[PDB]
């Protein structure tokens, strides 16, 4: 802290703490990662990696305190929610799409590193000035809030897998597209509930295992017929409703790939351009691609 003027609070974890910096000699923004530790391992997935993707936050220096290990990264000044909330969660449908995109993008790039999101929600995802989206760093784990997790994993699931952060993408595009999130249960029991009511009840036919489940019989949920998705999100397309659908799989293995997300009808309207991009340039640098006035 000799650099830098700590700044106030922008959030907390149980790892690390997370404050607004700027340099003393640039006086360009940063944001300080303050990680909250006789000896302390440091695991730090942008340490341990060099996660260089535009939808990534950019790793910029290292400060040792006796105390502390402060990680200094780029900065962008409103999260997903502070974004959805400042526009009255009336969110341009263009934009929605422009946003899922580059979503796909940093989370294809993690899966591609071996990277998962243990925590993947509207606060960990941030946007700036020029309508880019990219991932905190807070909440990434190498591959060894109830809102956001699948149904498989609440109904005990030993696998682990890129899939579960398929479900939360999902999650996230209605809550983009209509401003309001998708099953905001408060029990497991309740979550499991609020799913079924939209996705329907499995049967042998939909989820083959089910039934020989111990705690989802247990639970007796009525027998729910699905719903459906562009009745829920009339926002929406019928490309729109068909990519939800896809991602919001009961089972994780049947949840389409990020890759794949990508190379949906649902994204045409982009272009071939966008594909041949490199993993370090802003979608923002055609001009085919540009943000919409909210
Ligand atoms: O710009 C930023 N670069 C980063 C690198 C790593 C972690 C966070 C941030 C960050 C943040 N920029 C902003 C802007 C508005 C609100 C929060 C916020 C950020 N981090 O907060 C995320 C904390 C997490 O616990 C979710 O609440």
């Given at each position: 802290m000799e650099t830098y003027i700590k700044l106030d609070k922008l959030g907390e974890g149980t790892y690390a703490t997370v404050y607004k910096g700027k340099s003393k000699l640039t006086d360009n923004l940063v944001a300080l990662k303050e990680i909250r530790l006789p000896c302390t391992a440091i695991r730090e997935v942008s340490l341990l990696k060099d996660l260089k993707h535009a939808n990534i936050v950019t790793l910029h220096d290292i400060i040792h305190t006796e105390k502390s290990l402060t990680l200094?990264?780029?900065?962008?000044?409103?999260?997903?929610?502070?974004?959805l909330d400042d526009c009255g969660?009336?969110?341009?449908?263009?934009?929605?799409?422009?946003?899922?995109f580059q979503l796909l993008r940093g989370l294809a790039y993690c899966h591609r590193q071996k990277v998962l999101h243990r925590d993947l929600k509207p606060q960990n995802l941030l946007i700036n000035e020029r309508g880019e989206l990219k991932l905190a760093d807070f909440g990434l784990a190498r591959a060894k809030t109830l809102?956001?997790?699948?149904?498989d994993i609440l109904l005990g699931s030993t696998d682990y897998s890129t899939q579960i952060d398929m479900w939360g993408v999902g999650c996230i595009?209605?809550?983009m597209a209509t401003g309001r999130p998708l099953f905001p249960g408060s029990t497991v029991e309740e979550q499991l509930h609020f799913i079924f009511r939209i996705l329907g009840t499995p049967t042998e036919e939909t989820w083959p295992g089910i039934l020989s489940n111990e705690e989802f019989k247990t639970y007796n949920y009525p027998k729910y017929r699905a719903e459906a998705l562009l009745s829920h999100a009339p926002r929406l397309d019928s490309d729109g409703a068909d990519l939800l659908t896809k991602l919001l799989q009961f089972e994780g293995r049947n949840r389409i790939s990020a890759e794949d997300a990508m190379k949906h009808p649902f994204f045409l309207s982009l272009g071939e351009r966008i594909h041949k991009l490199p993993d370090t340039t802003s979608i923002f640098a055609l001009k085919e691609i540009q943000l919409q006035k909210e």
């Open positions: 200094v990264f780029e900065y962008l000044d409103k999260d997903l929610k502070q974004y969660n009336i969110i341009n449908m263009h934009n929605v799409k422009l946003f899922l809102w956001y997790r699948p149904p595009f209605y809550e």
